[PDB]
Amino acid sequence: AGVTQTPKFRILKIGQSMTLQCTQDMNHNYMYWYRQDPGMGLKLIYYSVGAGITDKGEVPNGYNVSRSTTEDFPLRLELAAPSQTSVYFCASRHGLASYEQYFGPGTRLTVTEDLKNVFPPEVAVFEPSEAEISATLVCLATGFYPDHVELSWWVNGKEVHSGVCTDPQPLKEQSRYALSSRLRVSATFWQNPRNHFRCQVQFYGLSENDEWTQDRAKPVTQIVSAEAWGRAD
Amino acid sequence: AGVTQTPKFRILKIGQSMTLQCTQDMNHNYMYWYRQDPGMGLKLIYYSVGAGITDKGEVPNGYNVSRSTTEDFPLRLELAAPSQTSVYFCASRHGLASYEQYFGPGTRLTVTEDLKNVFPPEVAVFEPSEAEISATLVCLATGFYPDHVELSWWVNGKEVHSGVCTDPQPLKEQSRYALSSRLRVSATFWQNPRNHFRCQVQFYGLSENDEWTQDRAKPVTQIVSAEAWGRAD
Amino acid sequence: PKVVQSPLSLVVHEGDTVTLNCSYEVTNFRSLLWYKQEKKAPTFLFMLTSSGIEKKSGRLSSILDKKELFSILNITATQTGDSAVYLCAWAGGTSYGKLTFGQGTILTVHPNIQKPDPAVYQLRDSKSSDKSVCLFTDFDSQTNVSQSKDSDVYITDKCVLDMRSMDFKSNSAVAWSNKSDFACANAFNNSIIPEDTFFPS
Amino acid sequence: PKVVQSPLSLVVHEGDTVTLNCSYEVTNFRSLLWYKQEKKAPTFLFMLTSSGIEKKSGRLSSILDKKELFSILNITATQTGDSAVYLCAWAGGTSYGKLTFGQGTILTVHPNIQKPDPAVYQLRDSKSSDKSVCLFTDFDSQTNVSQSKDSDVYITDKCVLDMRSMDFKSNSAVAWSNKSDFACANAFNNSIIPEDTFFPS
Ligand SMILES: *[C@@H]1O[C@H](CO)[C@@H](O)[C@H](O)[C@H]1NC(C)=O
Ligand SMILES: *[C@@H]1O[C@H](CO)[C@@H](O)[C@H](O)[C@H]1NC(C)=O
Ligand SMILES: *[C@@H]1O[C@H](CO)[C@@H](O)[C@H](O)[C@H]1NC(C)=O
Ligand SMILES: *[C@@H]1O[C@H](CO)[C@@H](O)[C@H](O)[C@H]1NC(C)=O
Ligand SMILES: [Cl-]
Ligand SMILES: [Cl-]
Ligand SMILES: [Cl-]
Ligand SMILES: [Cl-]
Ligand SMILES: [Cl-]
Ligand SMILES: [Cl-]
């Protein structure tokens, strides 16, 4: 019930416009917007110490802010630029004699010229193994751009964080990306044919009228998964 | 005038024999032999607490030791093996109520089956630059196997450690290796045509009757260098 | 140069402790705010405002003294999930309020495996052209992992999983291609694995 | 498991301090021997035998207390040439004498550059086919460096040089190929350099 921003993931062509909204019902005076990326660190863009009044941070240009109400402090990108590909964080400082600053879940957006570079991931489940000493099976998402994906495992219809490990960073095939995950279960658990495994990745993508990708299809926002069953062997 | 071993670098085919000699005039009772390599760390092979008496360390096999005199404590590889490619260190513990253990310069040896994999390095000096703001020139040794090389810079006939930086580890082209070095001097220093620069690498290699390499030549122990002169521009 | 943190990068085995030093400008100034960020929005840890101080919350302690620039930031029993970047932030005038974030301290803590049985296996897809994947697992967390050899093949880096039930915490990495000439042994020769490994044949 | 050292890997900016913790077995036992090894035979630093102890030599201090397993190993004003692996060794019975070496503490200390003017230049050979080499220099020591993109090209890692005269300590890395289609800008896009860089054209 703290700071909540939107959307989580975004893609777009250059010279294009976007609005990021941030909401807090926490009843806080001060709201911030931060920009992050691997090499440039975490830096402030815009900030507001109250409703109706804003002011500039370290990187005020490329961005614009209008705050009508205390609860919401959004920001807008008038013209998209490759420099603006990044992870933004809405913050809330309240505050009364308080410097504590709370952040929203964060948002990730990317800017690409052609927009035909966008591809949905290809999911596969690989079922091991010979030499099961005690069973760890892996899932591969391959050839996806942009980098926005949510990967996870569903066993018998339920998501499990139990034995799951996923790569913190995706591999580069040269755009484009490949991610790998894995889970490890008891030897007898995998050997039960009644047990079902699904490796699912949610790919965020275009919404409407891009149009699509080179040689048709579309890279819309979708879910692609892979299926495996218990092997009696 | 401390622990001194020999040779520094060695190469050979498998199933072959080699002797490493270690000498100390420091008048020390205890002499050791250690084996090192990136992943296995530093471990003891053989040790002698006096002349005539030896004993086994962690990895006694593959090796043999005979100590006739207090000063020298050598070791022998009867049959070469790829497992024995490594950096060995002769140590001296003296000692009387003293655990201090001093080491020789270290020796590096490699074992390869075909032995035709041995290649001399190709040296080049690259002379920069446009945009000299203040001049840093680099030397490239390329396509050399085995990995035993000594690189250094000679300015006007004298070796200089002044502005020199060399790569701690060589690059892999797939055997085989490539190493890069560089030095940086004052802008006016390079622009003097009377100043001479030589990037020299000493390559340790075969001695006699290998014979040579595939398609002739030979990879004997030699010195290959590269030459540059001051540019008036 | 308002804030500088040390060490820049820290890597410890599980447990023990870590002391993170933070240096700030003395004119003017306000509370130091400790945050821990891992692959997501920063999480508020400590607020040092005006305090003496001897202060602790949970397994951590924020105690700061003057000592014009310092913070203790101790830790106890470092756990595998504590790997993250730590930021002491900043506060000061004029034009309140604001935060100045340092480069952050990247902290990595390896898990303890007791009886390693490292090995490399081979696995196949469900319905496919019989494309396959090789898996390196059970080794010790210190062992490095090499990137793609010819770059036309794909290899991940060290990643650790866990099971609350069996208490087992196991590392792993995967390497794969579509090629039929692809073989695990032949594949990972790039970096030498301990002889404790396994090559079924 | 006779000896274990922490931290496993440590990276600090120039100066400050480092405290290296060494743990050993208590039955039986003898002197702890501190050595510093960099790309060559280990160099003897400290002998802790039987001592109390409060002990220091030069810029380092070996002080140890019991505290069944500990050693302080402080440091002052870390310098660029102090990058190396540190081993506390071991001594004990039976069957004297012997040393048990731990995994060692890998220590890296970055130099301080004040006014960076990072940039990428292009240079040519003396007598050749006009093969060329690209050079990335003057940047800050924290910036990473990516390995070979297609592996058919060659890129080194961060390396720092110095001049006693001009006091200048400068980092650098090189990237090269024989191809005429090879271009510095096009070459190093693998990792993003700060905009402070230079692309002469
Ligand atoms: C944002 O844009 C509006 C007009 O689109 C402009 O009046 C305002 O000054 C801009 N914000 C800032 C902080 O300048
Ligand atoms: C070394 O070899 C000799 C014979 O070649 C053998 O008698 C001796 O026992 C060997 N050394 C050890 C430590 O066994
Ligand atoms: C932190 O660093 C400062 C100097 O940078 C030093 O004086 C201080 O003692 C350090 N703090 C600790 C706890 O080591
Ligand atoms: C070293 O580690 C031990 C436990 O592993 C701990 O009790 C001791 O306090 C540590 N020493 C220092 C100086 O932190
Ligand atoms: Cl089995
Ligand atoms: Cl994920
Ligand atoms: Cl779960
Ligand atoms: Cl210039
Ligand atoms: Cl060298
Ligand atoms: Cl010199």
Short mmCIF file of C-alpha atoms and ligand atoms in Angstrom, two decimals, chain C residues 4 19-23 69-72, chain D residues 16-17, ligand 3:
data_model
loop_
_atom_site.label_atom_id
_atom_site.label_comp_id
_atom_site.label_asym_id
_atom_site.label_seq_id
_atom_site.Cartn_x
_atom_site.Cartn_y
_atom_site.Cartn_z
CA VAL C 4 32.34 7.92 -1.01
CA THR C 19 32.09 -3.44 7.96
CA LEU C 20 31.06 -0.82 5.41
CA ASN C 21 32.73 2.59 5.65
CA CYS C 22 30.92 5.70 4.40
CA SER C 23 32.49 9.15 4.05
CA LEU C 69 32.97 11.09 8.16
CA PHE C 70 32.15 7.53 9.28
CA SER C 71 29.54 4.82 9.66
CA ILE C 72 30.07 1.36 11.15
CA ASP D 16 41.70 3.68 3.30
CA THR D 17 42.45 0.36 5.07
C1 LIG E 3 36.62 5.27 7.14
O1 LIG E 3 37.56 5.99 6.33
C2 LIG E 3 38.17 7.11 6.99
C3 LIG E 3 39.03 7.80 5.97
O2 LIG E 3 38.52 7.64 4.65
C4 LIG E 3 38.95 6.62 8.20
O3 LIG E 3 39.51 7.73 8.89
C5 LIG E 3 38.03 5.84 9.14
O4 LIG E 3 38.77 5.30 10.21
C6 LIG E 3 37.33 4.72 8.38
N1 LIG E 3 36.39 4.02 9.25
C7 LIG E 3 36.59 2.77 9.68
C8 LIG E 3 35.52 2.21 10.57
O5 LIG E 3 37.58 2.13 9.37
#
